[PDB]
Structures are given as structure tokens and as C-alpha cells.
RNA sequence: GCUUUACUGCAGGCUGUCGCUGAGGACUCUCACUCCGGGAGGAGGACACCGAUAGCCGGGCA
RNA sequence: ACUCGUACGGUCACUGAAUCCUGCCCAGUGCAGGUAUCUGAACACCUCGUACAAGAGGACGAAGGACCUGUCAACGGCGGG
RNA sequence: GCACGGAGGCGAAGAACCAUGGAUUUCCGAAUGAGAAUCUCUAACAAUUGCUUCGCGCAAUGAGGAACCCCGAGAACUGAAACAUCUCAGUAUCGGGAGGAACAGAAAACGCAAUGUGAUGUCGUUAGUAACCGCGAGUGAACGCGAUACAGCCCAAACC
């Protein structure tokens, strides 16, 4: 495909959100990213 | 003594006789060549206009509107219907043509509000009505003791809610007694049976 | 039931439209002020996709290059004329009034100045018969005596491409190619071969219309199929 | 045009307007179709003018016959704004009436005469 | 879902009538209106188109 | 839409290359044409009725039907004695 | 900040926090210079209007909002033990439009017929009454009365 600049920005964001919940948040809340996505198992929008 | 206006009035009681007859025969030829809504500098029936609230002043506009003659223009049922709801030809709409004319005019002048309207004839295939519209935003009008009432917010788009004289008559609001049991204070509040 | 094919046609969807974007031009007569001082020269002969007949490109004196409905016998270099005083020769256009009786003409106008309506198909022609100051009588290709305004323009001669109909298509594929150049849905499935839901003649164990084919003129669309208001049928009597 | 039954020569129209101008400075004149109409009805009118470029025409269609059945003489003017100017107005005037002239009586008289002759 | 001379209706077509619509059981005209023409102008013409209604046909459709 | 199309066209149907052929039937039904007479709605018109109106009747009568004709490569038919 | 970590910082120059007012407020979005799946291309009230200094100079409209409200369009399942009028129902749903509420409203009324009432909503009642209806199934008011709240005016024309 051919991605536009906007499409690209959106894909970039999705890539960023797709990360681990920092360990310190674990401690602070004394004890999971429910939006973890896989490129294969999942399907993004657009 | 008789006002000059009464003469315009008396002429229009029989638009098919006298000079008026000839005027119409001449005029309609031009009207037929005009659009759906033509703004005009002066009312064709002055006495009527003034009588309905017209004034030679800034913010007062008059426009002639033409509409196709006849009954409803409805599409036959594509799904199952009992004989009763299969009619198509003799079914007519609930709004009279003058009301349709007032609405088209008001659409053409989004910023203006319909004050009133009257008939100026018809031929075998269409009817013409002139509509008086007012500019609620013009100071000449905001300062008029007789017209400033139309500047109120609840008067916005008054024609589309049936608040015109033609609107109220068509909603069966003329009578104050017998026969208005289901029209007053509104068709909707009475279950829509008026 | 469902709308029959004749009803689908009317919606004017692609399947039923003519390939207009592929058509050349509407061979309408040139408009002349008067005098007839308009002449041009045949610059080329071309194929007309919409009629399966040849057409001639003409360059006029005043610089107008336009395609024309060519009669048989027009070739490159030849000079054609269009006007009241135009010379009486094949390929020339002028009002019926100027045309001498007994002369075959084509692309005859219905109403003076319309550009030509009658006798435009391959190898056909109308026959100018009677003259007058009020009406010109022409005999159209169908054999009908037509009364026309003597002011109606026409081209002398018969239309090019005559005899096109004398050769059989021989195969479906040839019909196919021609049909693709017209506004027509082809091939043709017989009504008797369809389901009852699809046509007045559909249904039934064996194929046959379950009714007389001669339908009334007053029949509504969807029902007007078969032999429309026939005055008679068959070959007998 | 539908109410106009005879054409007035540019010249006659000239004298009348001038006569009307001196009429406002001297005698009395009415400005407006309504006022002009009452004059004819009250009979207080000697000469009534009527523009010919009035649209809609219904505003004046009545003047001619109303004047006839009142003996009041009337005349047509081509322009609407001239009658208004001549009447002393900063606007136009569809009709006008000289309610008793003044040092123009002689002229007004002739104009009326010239018209009746013009049928 | 489908059929038809099932019941009942509805579109649609034909036809009369009224309005559009004018002047002098047959007629002429031109001015509305319609069509052709780039235009001038030509053809037609109170008809046709359109609105209303009436009779007939009417598994095309419910 | 067909249609930058105009009867050597294109619409609606039937049969289904070539070859040799394609009989009889128009009563019923369908289509179409005609039609002296018969029948045939509404508006207008006339009579009765109503100080008006409802309404009853009359006269006129379009298409249509009756009636006549054409037509089966139109629906179809071509038996018993 | 939610959020109970680590590091670091701010606060007596009175921070945090709260109230009121102000500042900033990317792009798309009615979306309005033109175009576009949130970007791009070369000065912008696009479009429709009113006024007009006739110049976008001054203005209006557009879209949103839980429902409520006003004006239009308007089913069927269902009931009638079938079903066509009728019913379901002017309901569901659709088009347009206003407000904080809408709509109505100062009699060409009523007609407890009177020597009587006196703008309009609404609530209670009048009453499942009158009326409608294959006179079947079903549908169904009003005047009045008791309340709530109360409020009455402006044009056209005549004469100027
Ligand atoms: Cl409005
Ligand atoms: Cl072919
Ligand atoms: Cl009372
Ligand atoms: K039902
Ligand atoms: Mg990574
Ligand atoms: Mg006042
Ligand atoms: Mg051509
Ligand atoms: Mg094709
Ligand atoms: Mg086939
Ligand atoms: Mg099959
Ligand atoms: Mg069928
Ligand atoms: Mg067969
Ligand atoms: Mg077969
Ligand atoms: Mg045309
Ligand atoms: Mg059925
Ligand atoms: Mg086969
Ligand atoms: Mg933008
Ligand atoms: Mg039931
Ligand atoms: Mg209410
Ligand atoms: Mg029962
Ligand atoms: Mg009910
Ligand atoms: Mg009551
Ligand atoms: Na994926
Ligand atoms: Na408006
Ligand atoms: Na089924
Ligand atoms: Na037969
Ligand atoms: Na902000
Ligand atoms: Na704006
Ligand atoms: Na501007
Ligand atoms: Na039941
Ligand atoms: Na049932
Ligand atoms: Na019923
Ligand atoms: Na009482
Ligand atoms: Sr996969
Ligand atoms: Sr609005
Ligand atoms: Sr052509
Ligand atoms: Sr042309
Ligand atoms: Sr069959
Ligand atoms: Sr035979
Ligand atoms: Sr003026
Ligand atoms: Sr064969
Ligand atoms: Sr027969
Ligand atoms: Sr009160």
C-alpha cells in the first residue's frame, strides 16, 4: 500500500500505545495494558 | 371618501373582468418565464399588502412564488397495503398551496421571516402568491412599533411551525368554538386528528 | 412478479445504454444564413460506429470541418454545396422546394432546420414526388407518402452502404460485435423460457404462452408483450 | 398602457408640468395617488396628472374612469419621477392633482382643451 | 412465492366533460399555449400539453 | 433510456443451421377494423319536486359492448357416429 | 491528579486546594478560499439573503442539544377469534423548525335559551355520557361546573 502522512501519524500512535505498562506504575498502584495489539492477530482501523 | 386602495381591492374581487383581466393575461406571460421565487420592488395588490402589515420601509421585502397546480404528487406503495392505504391519485396533501409558497420564499431568504402572503392568480398549471418578508435584523424594523414584534427569537422560522395567518387557518384555528375541539391549541397535542 | 426486461431498459442503466462516448457525430445539415454561398470539399471518408455505414468529412470555405451524412458515390476531393442555389448533384443539400421532382434524396428534415430526420440508414432513400407552394410530397423508405414543408432540407442521392443487410451474420459472434456498438441488450432469452415470475409467458410444464399473444394497446407496461395491438397475425388470408 | 387610451405629445406634456410647477408655488396641488383620488371624489380637482410608467398598474387604473364620471380633466406623463419633481417632490409620484391652480388657470384651461381635442 | 374469466381494490391506457381558453352541428381567425429555428421567422392553435372528474379496459400491482 | 439512432431502423414476441416442406378450422377466447339500429357516465340542458337544496324523471350520447368483418408462423382445435 | 514508585522539585516572595473573572486554546469538524479518510494547494463570510457608502463595507442564516414542543410525511404485525370498512393508530418510523419551555389566546364565542357566561392553556369532573360503527369488534368528545393562573392590547381604512 501507500500511506499518506496522516495515515502514518495514526499508525505511529498505534505503535506507541502498543507498549508495556511501566513497572513503576506497578509498584505505585501496588498491583496490564488492555489495549495490547499484535500486528498479526489484530486489525487496526482505517 | 373612498381610498385609492379600495379601487385596487375592488378590481381584484373579479380578476377575470375589466382591465385587471387584460393585465393578468399580459403579466402571466412574463411570470411563466420567471423563476420559482422572484423578489419584487412593489406589491401587485397594494391594498392587500398594507392590510396584511406591509410598509414601504427598509427591511420589508416582497417576493412572488409560483407552485405547480393540482393534488398530491405521491408515489404508489411498494410494500403491502390494505385497499384503504393503496390510494394514490385522489389523495391530496394537508397543506394548501399558499403555505408551500410561503415556505419556499422563506427558504430563498434564510435571514428573513414571513409576515403574510396573498394570492395573485393562477393559470391552468400553477398558482402565484406574493409573500411579505421582514428583516428582523435591520434597525429600521427593530424600531417599528408595528413590526418589531417579529424580531423576537421565538418568531424565528415562524412559517415552518405554522405560525403564519395561512398557517393558522390551515390548522383549523379560525373558529373559537364548535369544530375546534381537536385543532386548538395545536394539532399535535390533540393526537393529530384535526 | 418481477419487472420484465422491457421495464429494466427504461431505467437507462449501462447494460442498456448506447456507447455514446465512442460515437463520432450527429450528421446534421449545416446552418446557412442564406445565399447558398457555402461549399466545402470532401477531405476523407470514415466509418460511423453508430450506423455501420460510411461518413464523409467535409472542409467548408469558412473553415468549418464537420462530418456529413454521405450518400453513395461521394469521394475525396469532390466538392459539395449546401444552400438554396446549390447545384442539383449527388451529395448536395438544399430545401425540397429547389429539388426537382422524381429525385431520390436522404437525410430529410422533418421540420425546416432540424438537421435531418428521415432516410439516414444504409442504402436507403426517400423519393421526392410532388412539389407545390404549400407542401412537398415525399415517399419515405417504408413506402409512406409524407407531406413536408417545402422548406425542409435534404441531400440528393441515396445513403451510402446499401446492401449491408444482404449478407447473413452467419455466426453469433458477428452479431455480438455489432450489438456491442448499439444501445441493446443481446442475446435474447425467449419469454416462454422464463419462470412465471419473470414474464407473462413464463411458467408451465412445457413451454408455451398460457394466453393469446395479441395484446391490447391499452395494456400497462409489464403486460404489453407479445404481438402489440396486431391488426392481424400469421401469413395466411 | 391598459389605462392609457391616447398618446400625449412630448410638447403638451412640457407645458403641463411647467403649469403644475407654478401651480404648487401659486395655487394648490395634491401629491400622491390617494390624495389625487380624493380630490376627484370631493370634486376639488381641476387637472389631474397620471404617470405612465406605474408598476403595478392597478395603482392608477381607476383614475381615468373616475375622472370622466366627474368631469375632471386628466393628462398622462411619460415619467414618474418628473411628475414627482414637478409636483415639488424629492421622490416620484404616480399621480398628481392641481387642486385649484394659481396664475396658471389660463394655461391649465388650454391644456384641458388641447386634450379633449386629442380625444 | 406463483396463477387465474376467485373476492376486493390500486396503478396504467383509452374516452367524454370542466378549468387553462381568446376573436369572428358544421366553420374561419390569432392573441394565450405548443413545436421548429442561432436569429428573423416558420408550423400549429384555442387544439395539444397540464390540473379535475366521469365511463370502459385493467393479475401490470396490492 | 432507446438516441451523436430514423424503416437496410429498433422495439415486442415466436421458431431455432442447411435441405424438402409447412394441410384444414375465425365457432369460443385474444387483437384489430367497421358499425344503420340497440345499449352506454358525468358536466351543461329540459320537466316534476323544494320560496332554495336534497331527490325523481327526460333529452343528448364518447370510448366500450351488442352486431358485422379481418386475422392461426394468435391462444388453441383437427372427435363420436 | 486517578496511582500506596524512584529521583528530583515547588511552597512564609503564603504553594496545594476552592470560587469568580481573564490568558493561551494545534488539526478535522456547520466548517465557510480551493481540494483532501484529520492533510495539502494559492488571500478568502463558501453558499443564500437583507441593508448598502454597491466595497463582503455592515449584518443574518447553516450545526448541536436527554427528552419535552410546533409544522409536515405516515406503516404493518395486531384486534375483529377468517377478512375487505373498522382496529392496531395519526402509533413506529421519516422530512422541516423554535424555545427554556413550546403551541394557544382577547369571540363573526357560548346556546345549563338566559333579566345568563365572558381571551387562552392546563388539572379534576362532566363521561365511556352525546356522537360514530360489517350499528359487529371497537372508537369517543363538547358546553358547563370546581380549580390553577389571570391581562389585555396593536394595525388596515376613514380624516390628516
Ligand atoms: Cl419565516
Ligand atoms: Cl442487427
Ligand atoms: Cl354559561
Ligand atoms: K390491516
Ligand atoms: Mg518498538
Ligand atoms: Mg399608531
Ligand atoms: Mg446526425
Ligand atoms: Mg454492450
Ligand atoms: Mg432466444
Ligand atoms: Mg426454467
Ligand atoms: Mg406474471
Ligand atoms: Mg413450444
Ligand atoms: Mg421448443
Ligand atoms: Mg425544445
Ligand atoms: Mg396477487
Ligand atoms: Mg431449444
Ligand atoms: Mg476549510
Ligand atoms: Mg383477525
Ligand atoms: Mg399544549
Ligand atoms: Mg364478525
Ligand atoms: Mg380513534
Ligand atoms: Mg359545546
Ligand atoms: Na493485521
Ligand atoms: Na427565512
Ligand atoms: Na414461498
Ligand atoms: Na375462432
Ligand atoms: Na480552553
Ligand atoms: Na456569516
Ligand atoms: Na458586499
Ligand atoms: Na384471530
Ligand atoms: Na389469516
Ligand atoms: Na366501521
Ligand atoms: Na350550574
Ligand atoms: Sr490472519
Ligand atoms: Sr433556522
Ligand atoms: Sr439530431
Ligand atoms: Sr440540433
Ligand atoms: Sr407459460
Ligand atoms: Sr395459412
Ligand atoms: Sr420611487
Ligand atoms: Sr430448418
Ligand atoms: Sr375470432
Ligand atoms: Sr380573566
> What residue segments make up the domains of chain C, in order of their start?
1-78, 82-159, 160-237
**Domain count across chain A:** 1
What does the alpha-carbon distance between residue B5 and residue A17 come to, in Å, rounded to a whole number?
79
Query: C162: which 3 cell numbers?
Result: 446499401
> CB under 8 Å to C5, separation ≥6 — which residues?
C185
CB C116 within 8 A of CB C69: yes
Which candidate, B75, B84, B101, places its Cα nearest to that of B166?
Answer: B101
3-state SS record for A20-42:
CCCHHHHHHCCCCCCCCCCCCCC
**Method of determination?**
X-ray
| Annotated domain spans of chain B | 1-194
Q: Which residues of B touch D57 (CB under 8 A)?
A: 19, 23
Which candidate, B131, B133, B98, places its Cα nearest to that of B113?
Answer: B133
Query: C226: which 3 cell numbers?
Result: 407479445
Query: C229: which 3 cell numbers?
Result: 395491438
Residues, chain D, total? 119
Q: In which element (H, E) is residue C215 found?
A: strand C214-215
Resolution (A): 2.3
What does the alpha-carbon distance between residue C21 and residue D31 come to, in Å, rounded to a whole number?
68
Q: Which residues of D touch B7 (CB under 8 A)?
A: 37, 58, 61-62, 66
For B150, phi and psi rounded to 5 degrees? -75, 0
Q: Domain C82-159 classified CATH 3.40.1410.10?
A: no
CB C39 within 8 A of CB C80: yes
Exposure pattern of D30-59 as b/e (b: 16+ CB <10 Å)?
bbbbbbbbbbbbeeebbbbbbbbebebbbb
Neighbours of chain B (3+ CB pairs under 8 A): D
CATH of domain C1-78: 2.40.50.140
DSSP string, B130-188: EEEEE-TT-HHHHT-TTTGGGGSGGGTTGGGGT-SHHHHHHTT-S-SSTT-TTTSS-TT
In chain D, what are the domains? 1-119 (3.30.1330.30)
What does the alpha-carbon distance between residue B75 and residue B97 come to, in Å, rounded to a whole number?
19
Cα dist from B55 to C157, C211, D34, whole Å? 72, 72, 15
Which candidate, B102, B110, B161, places its Cα nearest to that of B131?
Answer: B102
Query: For domain B1-194, which architecture applies?
Result: 3-Layer(aba) Sandwich (3.40)
What does the alpha-carbon distance between residue C17 and residue C182 come to, in Å, rounded to a whole number?
8
Beta bridge partners of B131: B63, B117
Beta bridge partners of B127: B67, B122
A46: CATH: 1.10.1620.10
Distance of CA A42 to the CA centre of its chain: 11
Nucleotides of strand G within 7 Å of the protein's CB atoms: 3-6, 37-40, 47-52, 59-62, 69-77, 83-87, 89-91, 96-100, 102-111, 119-122, 141-143, 154-160
Residues with CB under 5 A from ligand 9 (ion): C 188, 190
Q: Which nucleotide is the nearest neighbour of B87, by CA and C1'?
A: E10
Which candidate, C151, D80, D18, D60, places its Cα nearest to that of B8?
Answer: D60
CA B175 to C1' G108, in angstroms, rounded, equals: 10
What does the alpha-carbon distance between residue C78 and residue C69 come to, in Å, rounded to a whole number?
15
> CB under 8 Å to C219, separation ≥6 — which residues?
none
What does the alpha-carbon distance between residue B41 and residue C229 come to, in Å, rounded to a whole number?
58
For C46, phi and psi rounded to 5 degrees? -130, 170
- Provide the 10 A C-beta neighbour count for residue C18: 13
CB C83 within 8 A of CB C50: no
B66 backbone φψ class: left, alpha, beta (φ>0; ψ -120 to 50): beta
Cα C198 to middle of ligand 10, angstroms: 11
What does the alpha-carbon distance between residue B55 and residue D74 come to, in Å, rounded to a whole number?
29
Beta bridge partners of B64: B38, B130
Which candidate, B158, B159, B188, B156, places its Cα nearest to that of B172?
Answer: B188
Q: Which CATH class is domain C160-237?
A: few secondary structures
Chains B, D in contact: 3+ Cβ pairs under 8 A? Answer: yes
Distance of CA B34 to the CA centre of its chain: 18
Range of the domain at A17: 1-46
Amino acid at each position: 500500500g501507500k500511506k499518506s502522512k496522516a495515515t502514518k501519524k495514526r499508525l505511529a500512535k498505534l505503535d506507541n500505545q502498543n507498549s508495556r505498562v511501566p513497572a513503576w506504575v506497578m509498584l505505585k498502584t501496588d498491583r496490564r495494558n488492555h489495549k495490547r495489539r499484535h500486528w498479526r492477530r489484530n486489525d487496526t482501523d482505517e | 371618501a373612498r381610498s385609492a386602495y379600495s379601487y385596487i381591492r375592488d378590481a381584484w374581487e373579479n380578476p377575470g373582468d375589466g382591465q385587471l383581466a387584460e393585465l393578468q393575461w399580459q403579466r402571466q406571460q412574463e411570470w411563466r418565464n420567471e423563476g420559482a421565487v422572484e423578489r419584487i420592488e412593489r406589491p401587485t395588490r397594494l391594498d392587500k399588502a398594507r392590510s396584511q402589515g406591509y410598509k414601504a420601509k427598509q427591511g420589508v421585502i416582497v417576493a412572488r412564488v409560483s407552485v405547480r397546480k393540482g393534488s398530491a404528487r405521491k408515489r404508489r406503495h411498494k410494500a403491502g397495503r390494505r385497499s384503504k392505504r393503496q390510494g394514490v391519485t385522489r389523495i391530496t396533501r394537508r397543506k394548501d398551496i399558499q403555505r408551500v409558497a410561503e415556505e419556499r420564499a422563506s427558504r430563498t431568504f434564510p435571514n428573513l421571516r414571513v409576515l403574510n402572503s396573498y394570492s395573485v392568480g393562477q393559470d391552468g398549471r400553477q398558482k402565484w402568491h406574493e409573500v411579505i418578508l421582514i428583516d428582523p435584523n435591520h434597525p429600521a424594523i427593530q424600531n417599528d412599533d408595528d413590526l418589531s414584534w417579529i424580531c423576537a427569537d421565538d418568531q424565528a422560522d415562524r412559517v415552518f411551525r405554522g405560525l403564519t395567518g395561512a398557517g393558522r387557518r390551515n390548522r383549523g384555528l379560525s373558529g373559537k368554538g364548535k369544530g375546534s375541539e381537536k385543532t386548538r391549541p395545536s394539532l399535535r397535542s390533540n393526537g393529530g386528528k384535526a | 412478479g418481477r419487472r420484465i426486461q422491457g421495464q429494466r431498459r427504461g431505467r437507462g442503466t449501462s447494460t442498456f445504454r448506447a456507447p455514446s462516448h465512442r460515437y463520432k457525430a450527429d450528421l446534421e445539415h449545416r446552418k446557412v444564413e442564406d445565399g447558398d454561398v457555402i461549399a466545402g470539399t470532401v477531405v476523407d471518408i470514415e466509418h460511423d460506429p453508430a450506423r455501420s455505414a460510411p461518413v464523409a468529412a467535409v472542409e467548408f470555405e469558412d473553415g468549418d470541418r464537420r462530418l456529413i451524412l454521405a450518400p453513395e458515390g461521394v469521394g475525396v476531393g469532390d466538392e459539395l454545396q449546401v444552400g438554396v442555389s446549390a447545384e442539383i448533384a449527388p451529395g448536395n443539400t438544399l430545401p425540397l422546394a429547389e429539388i426537382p421532382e422524381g429525385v431520390p434524396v436522404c437525410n430529410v428534415e422533418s421540420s425546416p432546420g432540424d438537421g435531418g430526420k428521415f432516410a439516414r440508414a444504409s442504402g436507403v432513400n426517400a423519393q421526392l414526388l410532388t412539389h407545390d407552394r404549400n407542401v412537398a410530397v415525399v415517399k419515405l423508405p417504408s413506402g409512406e407518402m409524407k407531406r413536408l414543408d417545402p422548406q425542409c432540407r435534404a441531400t440528393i442521392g441515396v445513403v451510402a452502404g446499401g446492401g449491408r443487410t444482404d449478407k447473413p451474420f452467419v455466426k453469433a459472434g458477428n452479431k455480438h460485435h455489432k450489438m456491442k456498438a448499439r444501445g441493446t441488450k443481446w442475446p435474447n432469452v425467449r419469454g416462454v423460457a422464463m419462470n412465471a415470475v419473470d414474464h407473462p409467458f413464463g411458467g408451465g410444464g412445457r413451454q408455451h404462452p398460457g394466453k393469446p399473444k395479441s395484446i391490447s394497446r391499452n395494456a400497462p407496461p409489464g403486460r404489453k408483450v407479445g404481438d402489440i395491438a396486431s391488426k392481424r397475425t400469421g401469413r395466411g388470408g | 398602457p391598459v389605462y392609457v387610451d391616447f398618446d400625449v405629445p412630448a410638447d403638451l406634456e412640457d407645458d403641463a408640468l411647467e403649469a403644475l410647477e407654478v401651480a404648487r408655488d401659486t395655487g394648490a396641488v395634491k401629491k400622491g395617488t390617494n390624495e389625487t383620488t380624493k380630490s376627484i371624489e370631493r370634486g376639488s380637482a381641476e387637472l389631474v396628472f397620471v404617470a405612465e410608467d406605474v408598476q403595478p398598474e392597478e395603482i392608477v387604473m381607476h383614475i381615468p374612469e373616475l375622472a370622466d364620471e366627474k368631469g375632471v380633466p386628466f393628462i398622462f406623463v411619460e415619467q414618474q419621477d418628473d411628475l414627482g419633481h414637478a409636483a415639488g417632490l424629492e421622490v416620484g409620484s404616480a399621480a398628481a392633482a392641481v387642486t385649484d391652480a394659481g396664475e396658471a388657470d389660463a394655461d391649465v384651461e388650454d391644456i384641458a382643451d388641447k386634450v379633449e381635442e386629442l380625444r
